RNA sequence: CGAGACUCUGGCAUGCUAACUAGUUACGCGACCCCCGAGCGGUCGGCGUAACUUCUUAGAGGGACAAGUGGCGUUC
């Protein structure tokens, strides 16, 4: 019965928005990684002019920024880029604290922990690097790890033996056993290259995605596939709500919303007006971030803008 | 609490240091109104005469200049005055003030925030200059 | 507000011809404090209509051989020339400048058409940007002629041409040269 | 008397040396009688001329 | 690449009637120097990796080691 | 009042009386004339953009092959007639329609097909009297393939002439070989059998759709005379010219030089300066040395039969 | 002007042929996969190659261009070549036939066909 | 083969690597000024430690490919 509506639209960038992270501690600062090499800390404002004010322009990178993630406290940020360098931020000032060199190729995603002290990273070097918060080089986890670009690595906020998820473009979804960083569970079900993984807030489901439009959903406990969903265009981004047991998905022009009890499609999220440029491709969707408010979705577009979504119930 | 950036014309390179101050803009130790080719005095006043004195109030500005010629050093400073207040308003003031004040400058002249890359071409043999050639005679 | 030379304003300055209006500068957002700006205005075609026309009068006044790079020499000749206009007329001298430009550029010109050795010009039309370009050239050249070998100053003799053309009077050099090019054209038709 | 113009299209560049420009001309008394002209100097689309005759015919010497 | 592929050698051999002068140029190959050719290939040549054959899966079988 | 691209090609700015104006977005973007986009800039704010339904489209195409026009229409020409179908089902009584209308009722005459049936300056009085060039709910279409399908449903429409339509006088092409009529007047080869056995067929369509067609019963057209002649060897190369048998065999690219292909636009008064009072003839290029001519030029020699008395010094293409 | 070259054109088409599946419409992702496979010289060359790959992807997403021979697009093509409509145009009721065609099958013992129609001879 | 590709140069990097034969910033110390009625402020290519690379220099790596949009194109 719940719908979305294009509530508001943010303007700060020349380049495409690639990653957005929210935070439950601070419900007015939400952070945007971009391809004009900048990260805008947005002060949420929800006025008539816009839904938010661009507050800080984090500048410490030299190439495209492919990821951003905050700490459990809303004062630190960590953002990979395609310069190869992983840059730790401090949100109070806009000045780095660490600088994590140790990949050769472009770093695609950055693993952040529920413990708030684990940084072990994976790039287009196809290579997992063992570090710490300090940046302490333990070992180069490469031993039967991947064969293509490691696209996204996340952790699980689990009270059990904690589980990482490290996909690739080699159609693999892998489970490395922590306190070993040694590989146990592998998953061969997808076609085409993989692009985004989102883990359940329960601790039992991961949500793979990619080129084929079909999103495998895997039981994390037994290691068995549970739900395949269909696709429109290419999946770019996936997210999990904690309360609603849903799956949101980034289609190219649109956003396909789900319900994971009956594969129930909910709503399609798009606006285009002018039919003169109908031969021009729609601006794609790139990123997706569930806000811990329960009612707010943020997605960034290839037309270098972030558009916000609010839940109209009923 | 301090931001130091440069500006640049042909070979001149002027570096302006800004910190939380009380409205002094001195280039090379001496005031803005004192710099000698005063036929171009307003071109050095243009970052002030467009943004007003009130933006240059919690900011102290030293400018350090080398290289170039007279005119090229004048334009190298007005880059660096302007680029610094912009860069000061980024790190210490919100971004919305930075955009507001950056937009006032660029619409007056794009030169104030990005520099000309046009530098002197190499002279080649057979003539006095880069393209020119000597006279020749027939018959 | 942005005063030229800190003492001359732009909002008084009123363009008559719509033909020349988009190809003559400062009115509102072209308003700059000094003529000297040093931007790439000849980077591609039709960019030299967006530069301030006082700087156009500058860059065509350094033009001769002995003066051929000296721009601060010239923006001083300009600055002293407006204040002689103001003391002879009282008008905003930028308005006197524009009224001298408009009355100066000819409107039909001749053009040689035919084989080599045959001289039969036909009258053609004069472009608006060229009529700007022709006028400034005809204005600056008259400052050289009555002031090459006499006591009068070129910051002064510029202001005697730039007033006598805004009258459209016969005393100006840039008017007699419009009264010839556009006299010859109407014998070519 | 003295009329005006509107450059509607730039058709080509005529003349002996490639000098004059052959230009499609609208009037500014918004009459749809487009008498089409040759100018001297640079002219782009959307300019406005100033004639002393609108009686120029397509005649060859 | 004329300056690290060809090898110019110029001589002056004598005879009864005058001088002959010879020129010998040796454009070196690729496959870096086991006395043979340079390290760096031709800057025109664009070697593309041969089409690597990959196995296509149909059924989602999770090969868990 | 469905608007068509031909209404803006003739520039029928008639958004004043008919006020239910609906149109297709595609049929205005496909127009390559700039004065139509000039028409699109100001006036068409009174009309509305709309597409028809795929249920409505297929039922238009059913009697389209039954009126024998489905290959003669364009693809965008299909949707405009289906766009009239939703308007007629919306506003007008559907109870006054028909489909699968009527037979041919051949009215065989002793009139030659190439006779000037109602060509304006031709007279057998009828002058021009210089006012009549502009004297030469529904729709405004000037395409007869569009106009044929309308009146067989019994759908009175109008044109740039503000009055309604009652008479439809045009020409179609029936295959003399496979008995297949197309509404196209441009093609010279058949669409079903592919021969040059298309012949000119005049029609007359009323508002109800009384198809009665003057098949020209005259043996000057019904003639096997100039039809058999031996053909040269099939030639393959850059400059071979095979004698144009099919509508699509791959001819080599032979083109005129653009300094020869263009004529004089002698109307335009920007004209005085420079060259001779005519176009310069191309004597330099190898378009001229291979004697490449226009496909429209020399067409009267195509109509001459091959086995005839040509003069002893001619050679054509 | 700015005209591409055989080294640009003929080598970019091979990337299309072998690894179409990894390609996309970005300049900057086609370029990052270009160095993974093309053992290239200097970066200006691979930028022109990646730009022609991106332009060629744009040309493909309308329809197949002449230069390609794709193992994936031709099976897509054959599954768009197999347009099988409901009624083929060789199963029809009435086909009008000349009287001189009629006398042939009466002699070629197929005069029993009733789908024909002898028309009025023109 | 030539053309192109190439090499050098130029332009950009508040990103990386560094610097007692390059600097900047800070802190000492001194000289000097107006003073206030002490200072602070200031100028110091005046000379000493520390912070570090914006300026200087030179190494690696990125950067631009007609890429994106709109028209024109036998639409490539
Ligand atoms: Zn036929």
Curated annotation (Swiss-Prot), chain A:
GO terms for biological process: cellular response to glucose stimulus; cellular response to growth factor stimulus; cytoplasmic translation; gastrulation; negative regulation of cell growth; negative regulation of endoplasmic reticulum unfolded protein response; negative regulation of gene expression; negative regulation of intrinsic apoptotic signaling pathway in response to hydrogen peroxide. One of its GO terms (cellular component) is IRE1-RACK1-PP2A complex. The modification N6-acetyllysine is found at residues 129, 182. Changing residue 129 to A: Decreased binding to PTK2/FAK1. In the liver, expressed at higher levels in activated hepatic stellate cells than in hepatocytes or Kupffer cells. Up-regulated in hepatocellular carcinomas and in the adjacent non-tumor liver tissue. WD repeats lie at residues 12-43, 60-90, 102-132, 145-177, 189-219, 230-259, 280-310. SMART domains: WD40. Keywords: Acetylation, Apoptosis, Biological rhythms, Cell cycle, Cell membrane, Cell projection, Cytoplasm, Developmental protein, Gastrulation, Growth regulation, Host-virus interaction, Membrane, Nucleus, Phosphoprotein, Repeat, Ribonucleoprotein, Ribosomal protein, Translation regulation, WD repeat. One of its GO terms (molecular function) is BH3 domain binding. Phosphorylated on Tyr-227 and/or Tyr-245 by SRC. This is required for binding to SRC. The modification N-acetylthreonine is found at residue 1. The modification Phosphoserine is found at residues 275, 277-278. It is a peripheral membrane protein. SUPFAM superfamilies: WD40 repeat-like. It is found in: Cell membrane; Cytoplasm; Cytoplasm, Perinuclear region; Nucleus. The modification Phosphotyrosine is found at residues 51, 227. It comes from the Eukaryota. The modification Phosphothreonine is found at residues 5, 9, 95, 276. The keyword Membrane applies. It comes from Homo sapiens.
Swiss-Prot record, chain B:
It is found in: Cytoplasm; Nucleus, Nucleolus. GO terms for molecular function: RNA binding; structural constituent of ribosome. GO terms for cellular component: cytoplasm; cytosol; cytosolic ribosome; cytosolic small ribosomal subunit; extracellular exosome; focal adhesion; membrane; nucleolus. Component of the small ribosomal subunit. Part of the small subunit (SSU) processome, composed of more than 70 proteins and the RNA chaperone small nucleolar RNA (snoRNA) U3. This is Small ribosomal subunit protein uS9. Keywords: Acetylation, Cytoplasm, Nucleus, Phosphoprotein, Ribonucleoprotein, Ribosomal protein. Belongs to the universal ribosomal protein uS9 family. Component of the small ribosomal subunit. The ribosome is a large ribonucleoprotein complex responsible for the synthesis of proteins in the cell. Part of the small subunit (SSU) processome, first precursor of the small eukaryotic ribosomal subunit. During the assembly of the SSU processome in the nucleolus, many ribosome biogenesis factors, an RNA chaperone and ribosomal proteins associate with the nascent pre-rRNA and work in concert to generate RNA folding, modifications, rearrangements and cleavage as well as targeted degradation of pre-ribosomal RNA by the RNA exosome.
Swiss-Prot record, chain E:
Methylation by PRMT1 is required for import into the nucleolus and for ribosome assembly. Sumoylation by SUMO1 enhances protein stability through increased resistance to proteolysis. There is a cross-link at residue 52 (Glycyl lysine isopeptide (Lys-Gly) (interchain with G-Cter in SUMO2)). GO terms for cellular component: cytoplasm; cytosol; cytosolic ribosome; cytosolic small ribosomal subunit; endoplasmic reticulum; extracellular exosome; focal adhesion; membrane. The modification Phosphothreonine is found at residues 58-59. Changing residue 47 to A: Reduced phosphorylation by IKKB. The chain holds residues 163 to 227 of 243 of the full protein. Keywords: Acetylation, Apoptosis, Cell cycle, Cell division, Cytoplasm, Cytoskeleton, DNA damage, DNA repair, DNA-binding, Isopeptide bond, Lyase, Membrane, Methylation, Mitochondrion, Mitochondrion inner membrane, Mitosis, Nucleus, Phosphoprotein, Ribonucleoprotein, Ribosomal protein, RNA-binding, Transcription, Transcription regulation, Translation regulation, Ubl conjugation. Belongs to the universal ribosomal protein uS3 family. It comes from the Eukaryota. Changing residue 33 to A: No effect on phosphorylation by PRKCD. One of its GO terms (molecular function) is microtubule binding. GO terms for biological process: apoptotic process; base-excision repair; cell division; cellular response to hydrogen peroxide; cellular response to reactive oxygen species; cellular response to tumor necrosis factor; chromosome segregation; cytoplasmic translation. Changing residue 52 to R: No effect on sumoylation. Abolishes sumoylation. Abolished ubiquitination by RNF10 in response to ribosome stalling and deubiquitination by USP10.
From Swiss-Prot, chain G:
The modification Phosphoserine is found at residue 112. The modification N6-succinyllysine is found at residue 18. There is a cross-link at residue 102 (Glycyl lysine isopeptide (Lys-Gly) (interchain with G-Cter in SUMO1)). Keywords: Cytoplasm, Diamond-Blackfan anemia, Isopeptide bond, Nucleus, Phosphoprotein, Ribonucleoprotein, Ribosomal protein, Ubl conjugation. There is a cross-link at residue 102 (Glycyl lysine isopeptide (Lys-Gly) (interchain with G-Cter in SUMO2)). Gene3D superfamilies: Ribosomal protein S17e-like. Its main location: cytoplasm. GO terms for cellular component: cytoplasm; cytosol; cytosolic ribosome; cytosolic small ribosomal subunit; focal adhesion; membrane; nucleolus; nucleoplasm. It is found in: Cytoplasm; Nucleus, Nucleolus. Ubiquitinated at Lys-102 by RNF14 and RNF25 in response to ribosome collisions (ribosome stalling). GO terms for molecular function: RNA binding; structural constituent of ribosome. The keyword Nucleotide-binding does not apply. Pfam families: Ribosomal_S17e. The keyword Phosphoprotein applies. HAMAP family: Ribosomal_eS17. Component of the small ribosomal subunit. The ribosome is a large ribonucleoprotein complex responsible for the synthesis of proteins in the cell. Part of the small subunit (SSU) processome, first precursor of the small eukaryotic ribosomal subunit. During the assembly of the SSU processome in the nucleolus, many ribosome biogenesis factors, an RNA chaperone and ribosomal proteins associate with the nascent pre-rRNA and work in concert to generate RNA folding, modifications, rearrangements and cleavage as well as targeted degradation of pre-ribosomal RNA by the RNA exosome. PANTHER family: 40S RIBOSOMAL PROTEIN S17. Belongs to the eukaryotic ribosomal protein eS17 family. This is Small ribosomal subunit protein eS17. The gene is RPS17.
